[PDB]
Amino acid sequence: YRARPPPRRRPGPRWPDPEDLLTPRWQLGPRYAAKQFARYGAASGVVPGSLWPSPEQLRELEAEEREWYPSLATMQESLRVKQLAEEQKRREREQHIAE
Amino acid sequence: NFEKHPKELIRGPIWLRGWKGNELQRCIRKRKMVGSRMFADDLHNLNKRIRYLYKHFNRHGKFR
Amino acid sequence: FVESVDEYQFVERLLPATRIPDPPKHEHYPTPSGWQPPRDPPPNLPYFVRRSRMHNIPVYKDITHGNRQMTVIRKVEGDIWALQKDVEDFLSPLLGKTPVTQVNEVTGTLRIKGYFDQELKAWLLEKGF
Amino acid sequence: ARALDLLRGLPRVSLANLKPNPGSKKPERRPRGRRRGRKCGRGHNEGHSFRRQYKPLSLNRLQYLIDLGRVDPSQPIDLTQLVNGRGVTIQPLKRDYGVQLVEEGADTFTAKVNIEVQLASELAIAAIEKNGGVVTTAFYDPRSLDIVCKPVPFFLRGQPIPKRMLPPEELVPYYTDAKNRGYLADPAKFPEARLELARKYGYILPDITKDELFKMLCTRKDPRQIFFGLAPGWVVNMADKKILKPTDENLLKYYTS
Amino acid sequence: NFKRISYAKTKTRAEVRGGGRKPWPQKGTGRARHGSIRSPLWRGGGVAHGPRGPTSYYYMLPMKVRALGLKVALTVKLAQDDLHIMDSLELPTGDPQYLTELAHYRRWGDSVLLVDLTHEEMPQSIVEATSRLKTFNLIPAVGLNVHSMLKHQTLVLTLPTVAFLEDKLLWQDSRYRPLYPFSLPYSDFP
Amino acid sequence: EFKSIYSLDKLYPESQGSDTAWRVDIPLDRLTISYCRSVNSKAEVRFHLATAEWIAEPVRQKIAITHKNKINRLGELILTSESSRYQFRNLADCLQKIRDMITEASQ
Amino acid sequence: PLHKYPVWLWKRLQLREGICSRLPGHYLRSLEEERTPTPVHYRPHGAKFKINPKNGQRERVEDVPIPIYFPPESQRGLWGGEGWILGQIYANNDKLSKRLKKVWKPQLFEREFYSEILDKKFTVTVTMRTLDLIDEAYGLDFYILKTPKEDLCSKFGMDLKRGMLLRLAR
Ligand SMILES: [Mg+2]
Ligand SMILES: [Mg+2]
Incomplete structure (x- = not known):
């Protein structure tokens, strides 16, 4: 006859049962419902509080920057110090070679 | 209109639904997919043949 | 903290595209880098050439077997043997020897042994269609 | 076209006819027999990984895309433009650098543009400025460049918009000098460089501010803003066609880096 | 070969039951010593190189080429005096005998496959009569495919659905380099 | 718009005007340039040294003396060189060779 | 054939099963x-990320x-959180030698607290590290009040903490 109609998409983003013991951790965590919001808007999602980072996470990001990002002036001062040291070393080597 | 690939339309076992390697690869995928779901005979069996195949690939053959 | 916003025109230019369209008109021919539009109307030659999806003259090289350099026109249509005779005739002054060429009648292609590529593209361009 | 009618000269092309093409697969010889087998197969780099890689963009091919209409000049020429029409592709992996201009043959090249690449030749800067281009060079950090280049997915990623970090110390002096026509240098030092290049290019540097797209040319991209038209920290609600932006003060502060 | 994954298996030199020790006296008798009464040389042991593992042969091969071939087969059915394309697949009657007698009266063929624009919008009378069509079939939009393209003697395409197939082949025509998976949003995806 | 903490409004704090992007010796009208692939090439620039109003009279005499081999039969001084052929590398060390000849004729 | 739920939670599976699943929340x-x-x-x-020693790469x-x-x-x-270590070691701590299996056992001391x-004196074995832990807690009762039972890592001290909690809530 005529077969059942072909596969459709899922009915929007579905949250999983947190009681379900079978679910992998990749689609039931903090960023997972964020992915659900990125799939089905706020139209099926939740309050957008997941979008902004946490204040504790904000301090963590600040620590990450403080241990992972200097200022341009500090880099410039280090470059100036390195250039001065290189020029002094070159002058000393030239004086030693000349003597 | 690109909603879903044929790479999902197959009704077959989740050990091997579309990553078709060698025999040794077939068992490797079977392990890393469903090993914590077997009775102990299947786990010992899959381990046995996995050891066998790992010895089988790089030891004795026609091309060297 | 949250606020609904409608300025997605900046979103619109951020959307990369897929369906590549025909080029905008550069007034002179050839283009600055020398691209061309196919001439209209097409010629009344039984040899027929289509262009690329990305719109160029369909000529390509072929590299194999270490020293094997050859070339082919891919999307030939019509009485392709006429195009083979014409390619031999153009090639006749080019190297002297008769052209070592084979068509792919089911595949609708022509291939000539050897890389005579840029001049072949020129010959197709001078054909205009 | 005799093909279709010549095919019509047979019976209906049933399933009994779909032949593999002659030359499909060489014969699967079981290694045996009187001819093939009697014995059956036996007889009787230190810092290559830390090396940067930058995609070289053929600017003649940029002229091609200009002519072929892959990237129109009516708006800014960014990595968004450089990828969006598939003229030259980037690879975020392999510890890469990004998009940088190429160096051969600017003959017959008539267009106005505003190029933003990681690196380019002084000849490339003069090439842009010969018709009056705009040349700027910031960095594009690894996660940052990866988010930037294929903007479709991160627009639906769900995290808020990241901001581009500054380049590392080795890359810092590169952006710090306007002689490269970069992004992280003195905005007045660029003028003497343009004059010196026009002397070195023998170039008549036109007053591009007098031109019609001067305001379009006036767009020089802000640092730490991968999206040319969007706000730092934002969220592209692609379903409802909305922009979700935070308003929290410490969040604004860490966002305004 | 698209989806079939066979399940036939066997046993190896350690899989089937039994076998750890020397089976019999190796030299006292005139017989042949072995390693086991559970290797593959004896009566009951191993099928030594049989098909091990439930195997699969999926092939997501060149999809644009698959599209062009699907077009090609559609063209073959077009030239073969088979592409009888109807305006709309309405059923003027409810009896399947009406379809059978019209098909013999139309000299269409021994087997028929009619496909429409939308499955929910497929006409109820047509499917209801078609349910007893033991050799004919009715199909939805995406179902026009290759083994189907040989399956009946002829195919009956719906007119707006024919345009839909055309648009599909047109989007198949001149597809640029994919830099994102085409399931997500694009500039002009639908 | 948005301004970074390290934005150019502070990163170049003095220059807040747009015109400092590009705001501003050898004459452009007098000389003639030529490039042609001859693979090989030779790229040249010629100008009438007699009509050279951009050169001082002692400088013009020194040019006509030292570059007398470069002075043609028509009195045109020409200079040709060899690296690569287009816009920025091929025309303007031809111009800069002329300029350096002028500088050497100055002193 | 295959067993449906995973055995990696099989014990945990029984934790939701029956009479034991009627235990307190x-x-x-x-x-x-x-x-x-x-x-x-x-x-x-x-910390999280740091520069590589021989590569200079932030990892x-x-x-x-x-x-x-x-x-x-x-x-x-009531021992500490210390104990023995059952592992191995090399003769000169050099990986190019034939290593042997080894043990690192603690030195305990039988002491007493009151x-x-x-309101009683208990004398048991403890560690000098455990002595320092109690002294840093400044009292055995405060130490029992302080560390987690998972942090306790001892049955007798856990029992003492249970008794102290029962006395305090009683
Ligand atoms: Mg080839
Ligand atoms: Mg058996």
Whole structure:
């Protein structure tokens, strides 16, 4: 006859049962419902509080920057110090070679 | 209109639904997919043949 | 903290595209880098050439077997043997020897042994269609 | 076209006819027999990984895309433009650098543009400025460049918009000098460089501010803003066609880096 | 070969039951010593190189080429005096005998496959009569495919659905380099 | 718009005007340039040294003396060189060779 | 054929099954969380990401939790979080030698405390590190009040903490 109609998409983003013991951790965590919001808007999602980072996470990001990002002036001062040291070393080597 | 690939339309076992390697690869995928779901005979069996195949690939053959 | 916003025109230019369209008109021919539009109307030659999806003259090289350099026109249509005779005739002054060429009648292609590529593209361009 | 009618000269092309093409697969010889087998197969780099890689963009091919209409000049020429029409592709992996201009043959090249690449030749800067281009060079950090280049997915990623970090110390002096026509240098030092290049290019540097797209040319991209038209920290609600932006003060502060 | 994954298996030199020790006296008798009464040389042991593992042969091969071939087969059915394309697949009657007698009266063929624009919008009378069509079939939009393209003697395409197939082949025509998976949003995806 | 903490409004704090992007010796009208692939090439620039109003009279005499081999039969001084052929590398060390000849004729 | 739920939670499966699943929800929480204690020998590394020594590359690195080889008898007293280590070692601590299996056992001392919360003197084995832990807690009752039972890592001290909690809430 005529077969059942072909596969459709899922009915929007579905949250999983947190009681379900079978679910992998990749689609039931903090960023997972964020992915659900990125799939089905706020139209099926939740309050957008997941979008902004946490204040504790904000301090963590600040620590990450403080241990992972200097200022341009500090880099410039280090470059100036390195250039001065290189020029002094070159002058000393030239004086030693000349003597 | 690109909603879903044929790479999902197959009704077959989740050990091997579309990553078709060698025999040794077939068992490797079977392990890393469903090993914590077997009775102990299947786990010992899959381990046995996995050891066998790992010895089988790089030891004795026609091309060297 | 949250606020609904409608300025997605900046979103619109951020959307990369897929369906590549025909080029905008550069007034002179050839283009600055020398691209061309196919001439209209097409010629009344039984040899027929289509262009690329990305719109160029369909000529390509072929590299194999270490020293094997050859070339082919891919999307030939019509009485392709006429195009083979014409390619031999153009090639006749080019190297002297008769052209070592084979068509792919089911595949609708022509291939000539050897890389005579840029001049072949020129010959197709001078054909205009 | 005799093909279709010549095919019509047979019976209906049933399933009994779909032949593999002659030359499909060489014969699967079981290694045996009187001819093939009697014995059956036996007889009787230190810092290559830390090396940067930058995609070289053929600017003649940029002229091609200009002519072929892959990237129109009516708006800014960014990595968004450089990828969006598939003229030259980037690879975020392999510890890469990004998009940088190429160096051969600017003959017959008539267009106005505003190029933003990681690196380019002084000849490339003069090439842009010969018709009056705009040349700027910031960095594009690894996660940052990866988010930037294929903007479709991160627009639906769900995290808020990241901001581009500054380049590392080795890359810092590169952006710090306007002689490269970069992004992280003195905005007045660029003028003497343009004059010196026009002397070195023998170039008549036109007053591009007098031109019609001067305001379009006036767009020089802000640092730490991968999206040319969007706000730092934002969220592209692609379903409802909305922009979700935070308003929290410490969040604004860490966002305004 | 698209989806079939066979399940036939066997046993190896350690899989089937039994076998750890020397089976019999190796030299006292005139017989042949072995390693086991559970290797593959004896009566009951191993099928030594049989098909091990439930195997699969999926092939997501060149999809644009698959599209062009699907077009090609559609063209073959077009030239073969088979592409009888109807305006709309309405059923003027409810009896399947009406379809059978019209098909013999139309000299269409021994087997028929009619496909429409939308499955929910497929006409109820047509499917209801078609349910007893033991050799004919009715199909939805995406179902026009290759083994189907040989399956009946002829195919009956719906007119707006024919345009839909055309648009599909047109989007198949001149597809640029994919830099994102085409399931997500694009500039002009639908 | 948005301004970074390290934005150019502070990163170049003095220059807040747009015109400092590009705001501003050898004459452009007098000389003639030529490039042609001859693979090989030779790229040249010629100008009438007699009509050279951009050169001082002692400088013009020194040019006509030292570059007398470069002075043609028509009195045109020409200079040709060899690296690569287009816009920025091929025309303007031809111009800069002329300029350096002028500088050497100055002193 | 294959068993449906995974055996990696089979024990956990029984935790929701029957009469034992009628246990208190507080007991379920106390047996459910798995917070880790400070180590006995696994000195903590600095931070999340740090520069590579021989490569100079900013890489994120964690620290390995060394398993605490706990002999049964040490559960009968209030030991520390220390114990023995059943592992191996090289002769000159050099990996190019033939290494042998080795042990790192603790040095305990039988001491006594007199808790006011217990209002009694208990004499048991403890560690000098455990002595320092109690002294830093300044009293055995405050120490019993302070550390987690998972942080306690001892049955007798856990029992003492249970008694102290019962006395305090009583
Ligand atoms: Mg080839
Ligand atoms: Mg058997």
